Ligand binder design. Structure first.
Ligand SMILES: Nc1ncnc2c1ncn2[C@@H]1O[C@H](COP(=O)(O)OP(=O)(O)OP(=O)(O)O)[C@@H](O)[C@H]1O
Ligand SMILES: O=P(O)(O)OC[C@H]1O[C@@](CO)(OP(=O)(O)O)[C@@H](O)[C@@H]1O
Ligand SMILES: O=C([O-])C(=O)[O-]
Ligand SMILES: [K+]
Ligand SMILES: [K+]
Ligand SMILES: [Mg+2]
Ligand SMILES: [Mg+2]
Length: 498
């Protein structure tokens, strides 16, 4: 039992020689330079996140180029994620950068497009057209992931509403605005979004963080929009609204993964309900064998301070205990004063939580919750992990070209690193949202197709050797197909490493 397991732990228990959890950073003013990115990668960033609700296409293009350059100069593969606007509502530009909203003050909200690039503490734009046909005198308007609330007092004209500032908060350019329980009839994939998705495909991004995913059909709308050229691009659906939680099963089965988008979620549903929602969505994803991200406000105060709060240390550790593949930083890296320090802390907390994490129980729990009969390739993966535990193997090697096999093995949570030897560079990047996997690139162009698997295996074992995971005389569990089978891995072997 967890209780019994807690009594085995100590504060002096030394950490693992590898970290399983992966860290996602959002790139902005604080972190866009090729120098600042190399600091992020060295601190522990695996995924660069571009928020397409800010900046511009030319701005994010610079990010793309800088990330790739910074990564090439460190000799590492780094995933580029495109974060959609989605069916969302945002405020718009303020004069001078920011606007101080003070407790008790009265302001105005206009739907007139003319006020888009000119906004103040007294009058500013909101891009939802039929806002006036939704809110009445007395209702609340939520601003900046619900941190700021405005009470509508009266209707000034056809497009302006008199408001009251309920609490003191400073807001910046284009703030997110939420209308809980209103049924905002914004399209599944907008005319703006279709340009952004077209942009990501052209630039060859690795994954899409799709915003405000409400239905399975909407996920199909994104893939339809992505087109044939970008079908290998991963759709990671963001759950941040009420019906997104309700349709979670059908959403998960359509997606390539999930983000628990707690910022928008923690306003759209009651804040205490986000804990339960997080426990459910993560576990559900773990069972499905699809990457899951815990996001938003995890080390928030480190946007301003060199050290986190006790709650923030706890939050990051528990996301790992929950079973998240990834932990994400937003404003901490986008516009924070300690971008390297924050990612360094996150890695340090992830590694510590992993120490106390009971991967064997994790493995068994997941094993029990799978439909029997399993497919041959899933059974191979499950039983390979079983071998690891029985033999105390110190590394695992998987040949995977699409990433399918590597994620299937990771799904069973062995207590050793998974070394994926892949023939594709996008697979190296894409597996950066999968916990406990390190990729090795095998250039089948110049080195050969390797139909006998021998060369790719030897490359996985050498990687694991050079990382210090295995020594001469250790066991290493190897997964791939035999001489005949194509499409999946039908074979497992335990080999003595030289
Ligand atoms: N590309 C960018 N250019 C300028 N500022 C940015 C950029 N990306 C993020 N920021 C700033 O840092 C903050 C980071 O938060 P985040 O990236 O989560 O976006 P958000 O506004 O919270 O919306 P969401 O996270 O729901 O997409 C943003 O609120 C924004 O003010
Ligand atoms: O790309 P995924 O779907 O992970 O499949 C990988 C599996 O397919 C196989 C079967 O053919 O490919 P490969 O030809 O590279 O040998 C297995 O060896 C490999 O483990
Ligand atoms: O996208 C997010 O992370 C959110 O809305 O919190
Ligand atoms: K967004
Ligand atoms: K452990
Ligand atoms: Mg969001
Ligand atoms: Mg956010």
């Amino acid at each position: 039992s967890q209780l019994a397991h807690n009594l085995t732990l100590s504060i002096f228990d030394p950490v693992a020689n590898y970290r399983a959890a992966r860290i996602i950073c959002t790139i902005g003013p604080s972190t866009q330079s090729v120098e600042a990115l190399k600091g992020l990668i060295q601190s522990g960033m695996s995924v660069a996140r571009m928020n397409f609700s800010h900046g511009s296409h030319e701005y994010h293009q610079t990010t793309i180029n800088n990330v790739r350059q910074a990564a090439a100069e460190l000799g590492v593969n780094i995933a580029i994620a495109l974060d959609t606007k989605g069916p969302e509502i945002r405020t718009g530009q303020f004069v001078g950068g920011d606007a101080v909203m003070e407790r008790g003050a009265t302001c105005y909200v206009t739907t007139d497009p003319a006020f888009a690039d000119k906004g103040t503490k007294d009058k500013f734009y909101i891009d939802y057209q039929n806002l006036s046909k939704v809110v009445r005198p007395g209702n609340y308007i939520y601003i900046d992931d619900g941190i700021l609330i405005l009470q509508v007092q009266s209707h000034e004209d056809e497009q302006t509403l008199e408001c009251t500032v309920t609490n003191s908060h400073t807001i910046s350019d284009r703030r997110g605005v939420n209308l809980p329980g209103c049924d905002v009839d914004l399209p599944a994939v907008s005319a703006k979004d279709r340009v952004d998705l077209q942009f990501g495909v052209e630039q060859g991004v690795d994954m899409i963080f799709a915003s405000f995913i409400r239905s399975a059909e909407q996920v199909g709308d994104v893939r339809k929009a992505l087109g044939p050229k970008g079908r290998d691009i991963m759709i990671i659906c963001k759950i941040e609204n009420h019906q997104g939680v309700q349709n979670i099963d059908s959403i998960i089965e359509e997606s390539d993964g999930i983000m628990v988008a707690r910022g928008d979620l923690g306003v759209e549903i009651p804040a205490e309900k986000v804990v339960v929602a997080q426990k459910i969505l993560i576990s559900k994803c773990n069972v499905a064998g699809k990457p899951v991200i815990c996001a938003t406000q995890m080390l928030e105060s480190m946007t301003y301070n060199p050290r986190p709060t006790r709650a923030e240390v706890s939050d990051v550790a528990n996301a790992v205990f929950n079973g998240a593949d990834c932990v994400m930083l937003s404003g901490e890296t986008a516009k924070g004063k300690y971008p390297n320090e924050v990612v360094q802390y996150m890695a340090r907390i992830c590694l510590e939580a992993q120490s106390a994490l009971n991967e064997y129980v994790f493995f068994n729990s997941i094993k029990k919750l799978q439909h029997i009969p399993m497919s041959a390739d899933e059974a191979v993966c499950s039983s390979a992990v079983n071998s690891v535990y029985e033999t105390k193997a110190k590394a695992m090697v998987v040949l995977s070209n699409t990433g399918r096999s590597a994620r299937l093995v990771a799904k069973y949570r062995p207590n050793c690193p998974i070394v994926c030897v892949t023939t594709r560079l996008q697979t190296c990047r894409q597996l950066n949202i999968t916990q406990g996997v390190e990729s090795v690139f095998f250039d089948a162009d110049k080195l050969g197709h390797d139909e006998g698997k021998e060369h790719r295996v030897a490359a996985g074992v050498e990687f694991a050797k050079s990382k210090g995971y295995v020594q001469t005389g250790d066991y290493c569990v190897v997964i791939h197909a035999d001489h005949k089978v194509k499409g999946y891995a039908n074979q497992t072997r335990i080999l003595l490493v030289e």
